[PDB]
C-alpha cells in the first residue's frame, strides 16, 4: 500500500463490513470519500468531531464519536491530524 | 418515582456506573443536570444531537451518539422530545 489517501480509501473499502468512508480537515473540507459517505456529509462529520473535542481536554485524548442507528454505525476519530469517518453495516 | 425531571435525574444518579446526566431541548437549553455534566456542556451536547440527526432521515430513527475517551462514555439520545446525555465511567 502506497502513502496516498486514494489507496487508503480503496483499501478501507475492501473490508466487507465497511460501506462508507470519508476524511475531512478540521473545518469540513472533504479530503476524499467512498461509498455511502459523500460531500454532503463532510460538514456534519467535521462538526461532530470538533464538538466532541470540546467535551475533553487532552493530553491528546482523541475522543471517538460513534453514531448508531438502524442504518448502521458511523465511527469518527482523528488520525494524524485528519478526521476519519467509517460507516459500518453490522447486523 | 413521580413525573418530575428532578426525580428522574436523582434516580438516574443512583446507578453506580453513572457519573453525570444532563437534559437539553433541541436548542441547547439546559433543562437539568447532575454530576459531571453541567451548564457548560449543554450547548455541545445539543449540537451533537442535532448534527447526528442530520446523518439520518427517520422514520423517527432516533440515532444514538456515543463519545468514548479515557474519561468514560457519554451517550446522547432523544427521549420524548428531550435530548438526554448520560456520562458513564466503565473500566
What is the domain-level CATH number for residue A14?
A: 3.30.450.30
The residue count of chain B comes to: 91
**Cell numbers for A46:** 467535521
| Total domains in the fold of chain B | 1
Which chain A residues contact residue B56 at CB under 8 A? 69, 71
Cα B63 to Cα B57: distance, rounded to the nearest angstrom: 10
- CA-nearest of A36, A21, A37, A40 to A79 is A21
Which chain B residues contact residue A48 at CB under 8 A? 48, 51-52, 65
Cα B57 to Cα B46: distance, rounded to the nearest angstrom: 18
Facing residue for B67 by CB, picked from A65, A69, A71: A65
Cα B29 to Cα B39: distance, rounded to the nearest angstrom: 9
Write the burial class of residue A65 (CB in 10 Å: 0-12 exposed, 13-18 middle, 19+ buried). buried
Range of the domain at A42: 2-91
Q: Is the distance from CB of B23 to CB of B38 less than 8 angstroms?
A: no
- CA-nearest of A19, A76, A74, A67 to A46 is A76
Cα B7 to Cα B3: distance, rounded to the nearest angstrom: 7
Cβ contacts of residue B37 below 8 Å, gap of 6+? B20, B21, B22, B45, B74, B85, B87
- CA-nearest of A1, A61, A42, A10 to B55 is A42
According to DSSP, the β-strands at A18-24 and A30-35 are antiparallel
Amino acid at each position: 500500500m502506497e502513502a496516498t489517501l486514494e489507496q487508503h480509501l480503496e483499501d478501507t473499502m475492501k473490508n466487507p463490513s465497511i460501506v462508507g468512508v470519508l476524511c475531512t480537515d478540521s473545518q469540513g473540507l472533504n479530503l476524499g470519500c467512498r461509498g455511502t459517505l459523500s460531500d454532503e456529509h463532510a460538514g456534519v462529520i467535521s462538526v461532530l468531531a470538533q464538538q466532541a473535542a470540546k467535551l475533553t481536554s487532552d493530553p491528546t485524548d482523541i475522543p471517538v464519536v460513534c453514531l448508531e442507528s438502524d442504518n448502521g454505525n458511523i465511527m469518527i476519530q482523528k488520525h494524524d491530524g485528519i478526521t476519519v469517518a467509517v460507516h459500518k453495516m453490522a447486523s
